[PDB]
Structures are given as structure tokens and as C-alpha cells.
Design a protein around this motif. Structure first.
Motif, PDB file in Angstrom:
ATOM      1  N   UNK A  18      15.691   6.248  -6.578  1.00 12.48           N
ATOM      2  CA  UNK A  18      14.590   5.835  -5.719  1.00 12.48           C
ATOM      3  C   UNK A  18      14.722   6.442  -4.329  1.00 12.48           C
ATOM      4  N   UNK A  19      13.682   6.221  -3.524  1.00 13.28           N
ATOM      5  CA  UNK A  19      13.580   6.867  -2.217  1.00 13.28           C
ATOM      6  C   UNK A  19      14.642   6.342  -1.262  1.00 13.28           C
ATOM      7  N   UNK A  20      14.850   5.025  -1.251  1.00 13.59           N
ATOM      8  CA  UNK A  20      15.749   4.437  -0.274  1.00 13.59           C
ATOM      9  C   UNK A  20      17.150   5.006  -0.359  1.00 13.59           C
ATOM     10  N   UNK A  21      17.678   5.129  -1.576  1.00 11.54           N
ATOM     11  CA  UNK A  21      18.997   5.723  -1.750  1.00 11.54           C
ATOM     12  C   UNK A  21      18.943   7.239  -1.593  1.00 11.54           C
ATOM     13  N   UNK A  22      17.855   7.864  -2.050  1.00 12.42           N
ATOM     14  CA  UNK A  22      17.705   9.311  -1.945  1.00 12.42           C
ATOM     15  C   UNK A  22      17.697   9.780  -0.499  1.00 12.42           C
ATOM     16  N   UNK A  30      15.300  16.281   7.693  1.00 15.17           N
ATOM     17  CA  UNK A  30      14.026  15.612   8.029  1.00 15.17           C
ATOM     18  C   UNK A  30      13.983  14.209   7.460  1.00 15.17           C
ATOM     19  N   UNK A  31      14.529  13.212   8.163  1.00 21.41           N
ATOM     20  CA  UNK A  31      14.658  11.850   7.570  1.00 21.41           C
ATOM     21  C   UNK A  31      13.316  11.322   7.036  1.00 21.41           C
ATOM     22  N   UNK A  32      12.226  11.456   7.795  1.00 16.78           N
ATOM     23  CA  UNK A  32      10.891  11.043   7.280  1.00 16.78           C
ATOM     24  C   UNK A  32      10.297  12.224   6.503  1.00 16.78           C
ATOM     25  N   UNK A  33      10.559  13.446   6.964  1.00  9.05           N
ATOM     26  CA  UNK A  33      10.101  14.676   6.251  1.00  9.05           C
ATOM     27  C   UNK A  33      10.521  14.583   4.775  1.00  9.05           C
ATOM     28  N   UNK A  34      11.747  14.119   4.500  1.00 14.17           N
ATOM     29  CA  UNK A  34      12.183  13.936   3.082  1.00 14.17           C
ATOM     30  C   UNK A  34      11.203  12.972   2.401  1.00 14.17           C
ATOM     31  N   UNK A  35      10.870  11.870   3.080  1.00 10.28           N
ATOM     32  CA  UNK A  35       9.974  10.853   2.474  1.00 10.28           C
ATOM     33  C   UNK A  35       8.613  11.494   2.166  1.00 10.28           C
ATOM     34  N   UNK A  36       8.069  12.257   3.117  1.00 10.71           N
ATOM     35  CA  UNK A  36       6.748  12.898   2.921  1.00 10.71           C
ATOM     36  C   UNK A  36       6.828  13.905   1.773  1.00 10.71           C
TER      37      UNK A  36
END
Ligand SMILES: [K+]
Ligand SMILES: [Mg+2]
Ligand SMILES: [Mg+2]
Ligand SMILES: [Mg+2]
Ligand SMILES: [Mg+2]
Length: 83
Positions: A18-22, A30-36
Motif C-alpha cells: 500500500x501507499x503508506x508503507x510504500x 518526492x514525498x508527495x510526488x511519489x503519491x501523485x
RNA sequence: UAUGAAGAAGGCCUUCGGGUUGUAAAGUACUUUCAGCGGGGAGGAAGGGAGUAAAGUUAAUACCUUUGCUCAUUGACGUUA
């Protein structure tokens, strides 16, 4: 002794992630860039969960070294030794 | 194992000025114990057997007994230590 190398560390991935662990398992700049990056590629959310094949696709997008681990290996090793 | 402050990213705490994870990591040098792959190689073996020699025994140089010398040999462990 400090080059401009981008994140290229080896990362082991499980079957379902999942995203949180990823966020910290790859440690991309890119901490948010990874999320986007997921939200852009396909329909995805903050809590969305991806699969190991989709995780390999993601790691390919990031370009870091990818390691795939799945629990069925135990049957595969037994099958291999068969004469 | 030694070196290793860009005291890096990312995490967390933040009086948002910073602290910490921390020489820790990354990078740079050095080593190969054990496992793996090949080569070599003790000790556990004392003996028993075959001849031959001399002493002892007797009518008897025979046969047998006591002591030698010489020859070929005896290991599941085991691809041992
Ligand atoms: K930091
Ligand atoms: Mg060995
Ligand atoms: Mg001996
Ligand atoms: Mg021996
Ligand atoms: Mg005699």
C-alpha cells in the motif's frame, strides 16, 4: 565523494502493498510526488492497495532496483529438485 | 574489518530557527574463519595365516610346545580427524 546519483537502492516487495508503507519502503525524494505517481498512472487513493505485479510496475516507473518475493516459492523449490 | 559529514535522502519530534535515527547508510580501501567446489591425507590394528631357524620331547632326525626371522594380509565408521 558525493555524486548526483538518483535513488537507486534495492527494494524488496511483498505480494500486497500500500501507499503508506510504500512512501518509506522506497524512500523516493518526492514525498508527495511519489503519491501523485500512482494517482496519475491509474485510479488510486491515499489508502489504495496495489499487488506485487502492479508493485513491480511501480518500481519500474521509479527505476530503482526491484525485488519480488512471494510465498509460493516453497512449493517451487520442492518442484525444482524433482528428477 | 578500516576509512567514511554531502552530519545525504526518508522517518519521527519540532518553540518551525532546529534535534534525532547517525559513521549509521552511500562511496573508497582490506580480509575469506564456516558453509560450497576440487586435490591430498593420520589414529583407532592387537593379531591371526604361510614358511624357515633354534631350544624342549622321544627309539626317533618325526608330530607337538617355547622363541625368533621372513612373506602376504585384516576397518562398518568413511568421501574419517
Ligand atoms: K533530515
Ligand atoms: Mg568448507
Ligand atoms: Mg598403532
Ligand atoms: Mg590403520
Ligand atoms: Mg627350547
Amino acid at each position: 565523494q558525493k555524486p548526483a546519483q538518483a535513488v537507486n537502492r534495492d527494494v524488496v516487495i511483498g505480494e500486497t502493498i500500500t501507499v503508506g508503507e510504500l512512501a518509506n519502503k522506497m524512500a523516493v525524494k518526492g514525498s508527495q510526488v511519489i503519491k501523485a505517481m500512482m494517482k496519475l498512472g491509474a485510479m488510486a487513493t491515499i489508502n489504495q492497495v496495489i499487488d506485487q505485479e502492479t508493485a513491480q510496475l511501480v518500481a519500474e516507473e521509479m527505476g530503482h532496483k526491484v525485488i519480488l518475493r512471494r510465498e509460493n516459492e516453497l512449493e517451487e523449490a520442492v518442484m525444482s529438485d524433482r528428477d
